[PDB]
Paper text:
The original images that were part of the ensemble map went through a ‘consensus classification’ procedure aimed at separating them into two algorithmically stable classes. Essentially, and as described in more detail in Section 2, we performed two independent classifications, further selecting those particles that were consistently together throughout the two classifications. The number of images in each class was reduced to 45 000 in one case and 21 000 in the other, with global FSC-based resolutions of 3.1 and 3.3 Å, respectively. Using maximum-likelihood-based classification, we have obtained two maps that are projected at the extremes of the main principal component on which flexible fitting from the ensemble map has been performed. However, these extreme maps have an intrinsic blurring in the most flexible areas, since for any class that we may define the images come from a continuum of states and are therefore heterogeneous. The open and closed structures depict a clear and concerted movement of the ‘thumb’ formed by the RBD and sub­domains 1 and 2 (SD1 and SD2) and the NTD of an adjacent chain. Within the approximation to modeling that a flexible fitting represents, we can appreciate two hinge movements of the RBD–SD1–SD2 domains: one located between amino acids 318–326 and 588–595 that produces most of the displacement, and the other between amino acids 330–335 and 527–531 that accompanies a less pronounced ‘up’ movement of the RBD. Additionally, the approach taken to define the two algorithmically stable ‘classes’ has clearly partitioned the data set according to the main axis of variance, PC1, since the projections of the maps of these classes fall almost exclusively along PC1 and are located towards the extremes of the image-projection cloud.
Numbering used by the authors:
A (entry chain C): 1 to 40, 56 to 105, 131 to 135, 139 to 147, 163 to 215, 237 to 272
B (entry chain C): 719 to 802, 828 to 1114
C (entry chain A): 965 to 1063
D (entry chain B): 566 to 614
E (entry chain A): 272 to 418, 421 to 593, 613 to 649, 662 to 717
Write the structure that this text describes.
Amino acid sequence: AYTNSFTRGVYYPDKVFRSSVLHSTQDLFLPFFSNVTWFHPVLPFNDGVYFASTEKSNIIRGWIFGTTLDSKTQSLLIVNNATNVVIKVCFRVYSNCTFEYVSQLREFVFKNIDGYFKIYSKHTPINLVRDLPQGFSALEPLVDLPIGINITRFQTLAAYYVGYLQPRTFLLKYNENGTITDAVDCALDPLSE
Amino acid sequence: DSTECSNLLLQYGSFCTQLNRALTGIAVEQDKNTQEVFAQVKQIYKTPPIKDFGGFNFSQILPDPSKPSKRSFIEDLLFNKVTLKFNGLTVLPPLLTDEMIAQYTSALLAGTITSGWTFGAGAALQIPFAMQMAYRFNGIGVTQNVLYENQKLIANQFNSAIGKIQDSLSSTASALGKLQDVVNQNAQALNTLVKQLSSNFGAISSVLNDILSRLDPPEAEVQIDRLITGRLQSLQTYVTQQLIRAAEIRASANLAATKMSECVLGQSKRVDFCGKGYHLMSFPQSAPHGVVFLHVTYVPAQEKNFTTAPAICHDGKAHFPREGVFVSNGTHWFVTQRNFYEPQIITTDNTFVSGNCDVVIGIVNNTVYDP
Amino acid sequence: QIDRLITGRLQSLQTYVTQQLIRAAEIRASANLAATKMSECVLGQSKRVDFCGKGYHLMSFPQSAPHGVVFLHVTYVPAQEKNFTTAPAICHDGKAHFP
Amino acid sequence: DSTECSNLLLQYGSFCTQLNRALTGIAVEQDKNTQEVFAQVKQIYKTPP
Amino acid sequence: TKCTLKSFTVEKGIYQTSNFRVQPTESIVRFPNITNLCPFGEVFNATRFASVYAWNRKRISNCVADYSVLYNSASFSTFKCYGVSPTKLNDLCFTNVYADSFVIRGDEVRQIAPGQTGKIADYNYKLPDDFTGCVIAWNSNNLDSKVNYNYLYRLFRKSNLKPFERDISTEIYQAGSTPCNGVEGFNCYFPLQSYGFQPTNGVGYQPYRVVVLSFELLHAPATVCGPKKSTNLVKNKCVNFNFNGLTGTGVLTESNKKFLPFQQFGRDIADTTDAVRDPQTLEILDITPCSFGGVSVITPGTNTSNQVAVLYQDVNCTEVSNVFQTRAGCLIGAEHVNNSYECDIPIGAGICASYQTSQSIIAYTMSLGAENSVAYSNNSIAIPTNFTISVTTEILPVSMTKTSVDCTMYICG
Ligand SMILES: *[C@@]1(O)O[C@H](CO)[C@]2(O[C@@]3(O[C@H](CO)[C@@]4(O[C@]5(O[C@H](CO)[C@@H](O)[C@]6(O[C@@]7(O[C@H](CO)[C@@H](O)[C@H](O)[C@@H]7O)O6)[C@@H]5O)O4)[C@H](O)[C@H]3NC(C)=O)O2)[C@H](O)[C@H]1NC(C)=O
Ligand SMILES: CC(=O)N[C@H]1[C@H](O)O[C@H](CO)[C@]2(O[C@@]3(O[C@H](CO)[C@@]4(O[C@]5(O[C@H](CO)[C@@H](O)[C@]6(O[C@@]7(O[C@H](CO)[C@@H](O)[C@H](O)[C@@H]7O)O6)[C@@H]5O)O4)[C@H](O)[C@H]3NC(C)=O)O2)[C@@H]1O
Ligand SMILES: *[C@@]1(O)O[C@H](CO)[C@]2(O[C@@]3(O[C@H](CO)[C@]4(O[C@@]5(O[C@H](CO)[C@@H](O)[C@H](O)[C@@H]5O)O4)[C@H](O)[C@H]3NC(C)=O)O2)[C@H](O)[C@H]1NC(C)=O
Ligand SMILES: CC(=O)N[C@@H]1[C@@H](O)[C@H](O[C@]2(O)O[C@H](CO)[C@]3(O[C@@]4(O[C@H](CO)[C@@H](O)[C@H](O)[C@@H]4O)O3)[C@H](O)[C@H]2NC(C)=O)[C@@H](CO)O[C@H]1O
Ligand SMILES: *[C@@]1(O)O[C@H](CO)[C@]2(O[C@@]3(O[C@H](CO)[C@@H](O)[C@H](O)[C@H]3NC(C)=O)O2)[C@H](O)[C@H]1NC(C)=O
Ligand SMILES: *[C@@]1(O)O[C@H](CO)[C@]2(O[C@@]3(O[C@H](CO)[C@@H](O)[C@H](O)[C@H]3NC(C)=O)O2)[C@H](O)[C@H]1NC(C)=O
Ligand SMILES: *[C@@]1(O)O[C@H](CO)[C@]2(O[C@@]3(O[C@H](CO)[C@@H](O)[C@H](O)[C@H]3NC(C)=O)O2)[C@H](O)[C@H]1NC(C)=O
Ligand SMILES: CC(=O)N[C@H]1[C@H](O)O[C@H](CO)[C@]2(O[C@@]3(O[C@H](CO)[C@@H](O)[C@H](O)[C@H]3NC(C)=O)O2)[C@@H]1O
Ligand SMILES: CC(=O)N[C@H]1[C@H](O)O[C@H](CO)[C@]2(O[C@@]3(O[C@H](CO)[C@@H](O)[C@H](O)[C@H]3NC(C)=O)O2)[C@@H]1O
Ligand SMILES: CC(=O)N[C@H]1[C@H](O)O[C@H](CO)[C@]2(O[C@@]3(O[C@H](CO)[C@@H](O)[C@H](O)[C@H]3NC(C)=O)O2)[C@@H]1O
Ligand SMILES: *[C@@]1(O)O[C@H](CO)[C@@H](O)[C@H](O)[C@H]1NC(C)=O
Ligand SMILES: *[C@@]1(O)O[C@H](CO)[C@@H](O)[C@H](O)[C@H]1NC(C)=O
Ligand SMILES: *[C@@]1(O)O[C@H](CO)[C@@H](O)[C@H](O)[C@H]1NC(C)=O
Ligand SMILES: CC(=O)N[C@@H]1[C@@H](O)[C@H](O)[C@@H](CO)O[C@H]1O
C-alpha cells in the first residue's frame, strides 16, 4: 500500500545558522515524490530512514533498532514513556550493556553516520487524515551514541509511513530567522536541476 | 596570520608584490577612467536662475537643489535602478565621489544648454537655445527656418520624449543591464575568491590552524604547502580575471570619453554613433558605475512620393539644383531641400547652370523663372 | 627537488607571458588609436571634436618618439569674445529674412 | 569519466565551474558580435525585379 | 618606502608601504559547563575491593574524566604510567578505558607491570608488554586488616595467564602424574590461598589496593575525554577566541540575530563564521574581523623634502602631529585646510594631498574647477573677435620591446 513521499522529509544538515541565503547540501535525504511503503512487523535499514507516524491515541511506542536482534549482538532499543525517553545499547517484546541515555503529523528522521545515531523530529497540526500533505518543516532534536554498527531493523510497536534516505544534493532556502522555509531537489526534475 | 605559513609563502618569491602591483595598477586605472570620461570641462558652469530655453524643458536632467545629493531627477532614478572587509580583501573608495561626478555632469549640461558647442572649443559663448537648435538643424542639413516656424512643435516633441525616458527607467526592469552586470561580475569574483579558502586543495583539512595543530611540523609542512599553492593559484586566477575585465572596461570607458567629447560637446556627423537618426545634441547623466547619454536625434517621417529629375533643361542649358532636389507633384517642378519637403519656384538664383541639354541623361524640360 | 624547481619556474614563466599578452593587447589598442590619429589628423583635417587637440582642428604633424609617436596638433581657439544682441529673423516688408 | 578522479577533483574547488562560465561567456559574446555587426537593419529589403 | 621601492629616491606619489592589522590581546577559550563528570570515585573509594584472582574490571564510558584528581592526590604509594602521560591527557580522548581493581601485598605491587613474573603476574593478573595505562596502588592496612575481609590469590595454574585474562576456576591443580578426582590428595592441591593480612605485618606484607587504568586509541569513535578549562569573555576588543573547538580571531559583539535552539554558530555567506553562541551562557555573539588595512605613505618626492604623511586605509583611528579622519582612512602628519585646490596626490574619497607652504603637507577636498555662470539670455550672443592658434602634444605608445624567453634554458639550464 505505497504512497508518494511528498516534499516533506527534509532535515537540517548541520548545526550552522544561515540567514536569507540559499545553500546546497550533499548528504542523505528523502527523495521528493518517492513512493514510501505505508505499513498498516518487519522493516530493513539499508540506510538512514524517514519514519512518519500518526496516532490519535499515541499507540505507537519507541523503535527497537537492531543489527541482528538475536540477543547475540547489541541492540539500540529506543523506547518512549510518559515521563522520559530511555535508550539503551542492551515489556512484552524482548530478545554487555555499552551505554544508556535518558532524557525528555510526527516527523522522525533516523540515520547512522560513522557510528553516530542522529534523530530529527517535528510536530505538526495535521488537519487531513490518511495523507501527509506536501509542506515544509524540519528540526534536529537528537541523541548521539557511538555504536559503530549498521542497524537493519525497526520493529515499531495506527499506521506509519516509512521512506529511505538517499545521498542526493538539495538546495535549501533559509529564512531571516535561520529556519529552512523551503527547498528544491536537484535531480528531481530538469526545472529543479 | 600564520607564521609557519608565512615562511613557506616567503620562500616562493615575489609573486605577491607582483599581484599587489597588478591590483593597484587596475585600481588607479579605474580613477583614470572616471576622470577621463567626466573631467572634460575646464570650469564648472552654473545654469542661469530662470529657465526660459525657448520652450524646451530641462527640469528632469538639470540638478535640483531640493535633493540633498544635488543630482538630477533622472540620475536619482538611475541610481535607484541598480542594486549595489572579510579576510585580506579591501575595496578602496573611488577618488571622485558620486556628488563630484554629478557636479561634472551638471557643469557639462549647463555648458551645452547655454553655450552650445563653444565651451568645448574654448571660452563659453552663449547663444539663445532656439538659435543654437537652428545651428544644429543647419548641421544635419535642414535649413534653420524649419525650426523657427516649428519651434513650439519641436519643443513639445523634445519634452514628451524626455518624459518617455522617465517611464522607461522607472517601470521597465533591467534597463541598466550593463552596469548591473559589472557590479554582479565584481561581486561574483570576490565571492568565488573567498569560497576558494574552504576548498581542501588535496590537504588533510582546509582550515590552516587545524592542519598545524594535529601534525608534526615536518609532516604539516607538506599539507600547508598544498594549501598555499592552491590558494595562491586561486588568487592568481582572480588577478588575471581582473586584469582582462579591466581592459574591457577601459575600452568601454574610452568609448564613453569619446562619445562625451564628440556628442555632448559637439555635434557629430558620424551616422549611428550617437543614436539612430541625424544627431542634434546629447546630454550626459551620471549612473553609479557609468555614464548614460540621452541622444536627441532628428528622424524624418511622413514621406511623400515625388517625380524627380537630375537637371532642368531650359533655353538650351542645364540647370542643376544648388542645394535641393528638383521634385514634381505631377504638373509643376520645384526645388526642395532633401531632408524637408519645402517647395520653391525654380529660379536662376537657386539653380546653377553648367553645360547644355544633350549630355546629361534623364533631364526634363521646364522654365526657370528669372528674377 | 628538480620537480619542485621546474614547477615553480614554469609557473613564473607562464604568468610572465600572460601579463605580456595583456600588455601587448593594451599597446595594440594604443597603436590602433595612433594609426587612426595619423590617418584622420595628419593625412587630413578632422571635424570630430577633441579627437586632435582642444579647439577646432587646423592640422597636425607627427614626430617620432622612442617607442611611440608625438602629434603636434595645430588648432584654432577663438578668443576676445564680445556681447551682442541677437535675433533669429528680420521682418522686412512682411517677410522673414534668415541668415 | 572516472569517479575516483572526479572525487579528487572536487577538492580543488570551483575551478571547473569558473572555466565553464568563462567559456560560455565567450560563446555568447560571439553571437553578440555577429548580431552587432550584421543586424543593423530593422527590416529586410528586396531589390526591385 | 625606499625599501619597498628598491631606491634611495622616490617620486611624488602615494605608495602602499605595508599592511597594518591590530594584534589580538588576551585570547579566550570557552566550553560548556562540566555537568556530567567519570566515576573514578566509586572505583577508588570502593568500600570493598576484590581478590586478585577474581580482579574486578570497570568499563569507563560516556563521561569526561578529570585525571587531575588522581595525580594531585597525596594518598598514593605508586603511580606508574606506561606509554601515556597522566599530566597530558586532560585534552585527550580514548576509544576505550578499563579500570581494574584488586588487592595484593607490598612486594607484589612491583609485579603489576609489563614483563614481570611471579605468583600474581603469572596466575592472577598479567599486563601486556605494550601496556598503555597507569598502575596506581596505596597501602590499605587500615581497611583490609583486622584482628574481617578474606582476600585470596591463586597458587598454581597449568599455564601462564594471557594479558588481561581472568581465571576464577576452583578446580584441583594436578601437579603429578596421578589424576585428581575433584578432590585434594597426593600431588593434588586446591589452587587458592588466603592472604595473612595481620595489622602487625611488615610493610611488604600488608595489603595494597591497586587500580589499573588501561587505555585504547584506535581509529574509531571515542567517549572518554579530560576536562576543558574555560574563562570569561570580552567585548569590542580584537581577541583570539576558542568557542566549542572553533578557533578564530575577531571582535566579539552583541548580535541582534536570533539563532534557533539547536544552532551553535552561524555563517552569513561564503562559509565564513559570522556569529557564534557561547556554550555557557547560551548567548549569541557577532564576530567582526578586527580592523586591518594597508598603510601607504604620501611623499612629495625625496629631493623636494623628507616629509611624509601616513594613511592607514579604512581604519577609524581611535588607535595607532595631528590625526585627521577621512573617508579613505586616517591621515597622520598632514594638516587639513578648508580652501581647495587642484588634485596633486590622490588619497581617495574625494580628498587629495599636496606639499605647499611653512612647507607642510596639506590634505584638502579637491576642487573640480573654477566656477562661472555664463550669462545666458534669450537675445544675447557672444561672438569671438579674435583668435589664437595653439599647437599641443599628444603622446602615444605604439610598440614594446620584442622579448624572447628560451623556455628550456630558463627553466633548467
Ligand atoms: C588679436 O585679437 O590678438 C592678437 C594677439 O596676438 C593681437 O596682436 C597683438 O597686438 C598687440 C597690440 O598692438 C601687440 O602688442 C604690441 O606689439 C608691439 C610690436 O608690434 C610692441 O612694440 C608693443 O609693446 C609696446 O607697447 C606696450 C603696450 O603699449 C607696452 O606695454 C610695451 O612696453 C611697449 O612699449 O610693446 C606691444 O607689445 O602688442 C602684440 O605684439 C600683438 N601680438 C602679435 C602676436 O602680433 O596682436 C591683435 O592686435 C588682436 N586683434 C584685434 C583686432 O584685436
Ligand atoms: C521630353 C521633352 O519634351 N524633350 C524636349 C525638350 O524639352 O526640348 C527640346 C528642345 O526642343 C526637344 O528637342 C527636340 O527633340 C525633337 C525630337 O528629336 C527634335 O525634333 C527633330 O529634330 C531633328 C534634329 O534637328 C530634326 O531633323 C527633325 O525634324 C525632321 O523630323 C520631324 C519628325 O521628327 C519632321 O516633322 C520634320 O518636318 C523634319 O522632317 O526634323 C525634328 O525637328 O525633333 C527637335 O528638333 C528638338 N528641338 C531642338 C530645339 O533641338 O528637343 C526635346 O525633345
Ligand atoms: C523571526 O526570525 O522571524 C519572524 C517572522 O518573520 C519575526 O517575527 C515578527 O517580527 C516582527 C518584528 O520583530 C513582529 O512585529 C511586532 O510584533 C509585536 C508582537 O509580536 C508587536 O507588538 C509589534 O508592534 C510589531 O508588530 O512585529 C512580529 O509580531 C513577529 N511575528 C510573530 C511574533 O509572529 O516575527 C521575528 O522578528 C524574527 N526574529 C527576529 C529576532 O527578528
Ligand atoms: C510614401 C509612399 O506613398 N510610398 C509609396 C509606397 O508605399 C509604394 O510601395 C508599396 O508602398 O509597397 C508595397 C509592398 O509591401 C506594395 O504593395 C503590394 O500590394 C499587393 C496587393 O495590392 C500585395 O500582394 C503585395 O504583397 C504588396 O503588399 O504593396 C506596393 O508597391 C505599395 N503599397 C501600397 C501603395 O499600398 C510605392 C509603389 O510604387 O509607391 C510609393 O510612393
Ligand atoms: C556679456 O556680454 O554680458 C554678461 C552680462 O552683462 C557678462 O556677464 C557678467 O559680467 C560682469 C562683469 O564682467 C560680472 O560681474 C557678472 O558676474 C557677469 N555675469 C552675470 C551678470 O550673470 O556677464 C559677460 O561678462 C559679458 N561678456 C563679455 C565677453 O563681456
Ligand atoms: C552553566 O553551566 O553554569 C552557569 C553558572 O551558574 C549558569 O549561569 C547562570 O545562568 C542563569 C540562566 O539565566 C542565570 O540566571 C545565572 O545568573 C547564571 N549564573 C552564573 C553564575 O553565571 O549561569 C549557566 O546557565 C549554566 N549553563 C548550562 C547550559 O548549564
Ligand atoms: C574650517 O575651514 O571650516 C570649519 C567649518 O565648520 C570651521 O569650523 C567652524 O568654525 C567656526 C569658527 O571658529 C565655529 O563657530 C564653528 O562651530 C566650527 N564648526 C565646526 C563643525 O567645527 O569650523 C573651522 O574653524 C575652519 N578652520 C579654518 C582654519 O578656517
Ligand atoms: C509508569 C512509569 O513511570 N514507568 C516507567 C517509565 O516509563 O520509565 C522510568 C524509567 O526512568 C521507569 O522508572 C525506573 O524504574 C527502574 C526500575 O526500578 C529504576 O531503576 C529507575 O531508577 C526508574 N527511573 C526513574 C526515572 O524513575 O522508572 C518507570 O517505571
Ligand atoms: C517650465 C515647466 O513647466 N517645466 C516643467 C518641466 O519641463 O517638467 C517638469 C516635470 O514634469 C515639470 O514639473 C512638474 O509640473 C507639473 C505641472 O504639470 C506639476 O504638477 C509637478 O508637480 C511638477 N513636478 C514634477 C516632479 O512633476 O514639473 C515642470 O513644470
Ligand atoms: C497635380 C497637382 O495638383 N500638382 C500641383 C503641384 O504639386 O504643385 C503646384 C504648385 O502648388 C500646383 O499648382 C498650383 O496649385 C495651387 C493650389 O493652391 C493653385 O492655387 C495654383 O493655381 C496652381 N498653379 C500654379 C501655382 O501655377 O499648382 C499643382 O496643382
Ligand atoms: C574519593 O572516594 O575518591 C576520590 C578519587 O576519585 C578522591 O579524590 C577523594 O578524596 C575520595 N573521597 C574522600 C576521601 O572523601
Ligand atoms: C631634485 O629634487 O633635487 C636635486 C638636489 O638633491 C636637484 O639637483 C634636482 O634638480 C631636483 N629635481 C627637480 C626636478 O627639481
Ligand atoms: C570611530 O571609528 O569610533 C568612535 C568610538 O568607537 C566613534 O565615536 C566614532 O563615531 C567612529 N567614527 C567613525 C568615522 O567610524
Ligand atoms: C563478546 C563481545 O562482543 N564483547 C564486547 C566487547 O568486545 C566490547 O569491547 C565491550 C564494550 O563495552 O562490550 C562487550 O560486550
